Design a protein around this ligand. Structure first.
Ligand SMILES: [Mg+2]
Ligand SMILES: [Mg+2]
Ligand SMILES: [Mg+2]
Length: 45
RNA sequence: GAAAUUGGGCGCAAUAGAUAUAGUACCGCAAGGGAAAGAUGAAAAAUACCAAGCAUAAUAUAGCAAGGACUA
């Protein structure tokens, strides 16, 4: 063990590069898709 | 295909029922063809919720548009 040590375009590129994903999931989506979403989904465990 | 002979409504109710509110409007030189549509209430001397289409609310990679799903 080691001891404990003590704008839309550029913002979407910055998030892509930060979280190692592509750009597409940072663009929004329309109302038809925002309102189909279940905001009170079933929980378990 | 003979003859003798024998002896009111388990209706329609405005695309229905009349073409019919009218043989008018309209069309045709003419004969002739030929429509559509209305809905308050006792009194007008009392002025809701439902088709398609839209709007509230445009859109986000991929595709008979869904289905299996899924925390989404
Ligand atoms: Mg008639
Ligand atoms: Mg509708
Ligand atoms: Mg696919």
């Amino acid at each position: 063990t080691k001891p404990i040590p003590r704008e839309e375009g550029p913002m979407i590129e910055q998030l892509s590069k930060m979280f190692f994903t592509t750009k597409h999931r940072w663009y929004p989506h329309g109302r038809y898709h925002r309102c189909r979403k279940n905001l009170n989904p079933p929980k378990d465990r």
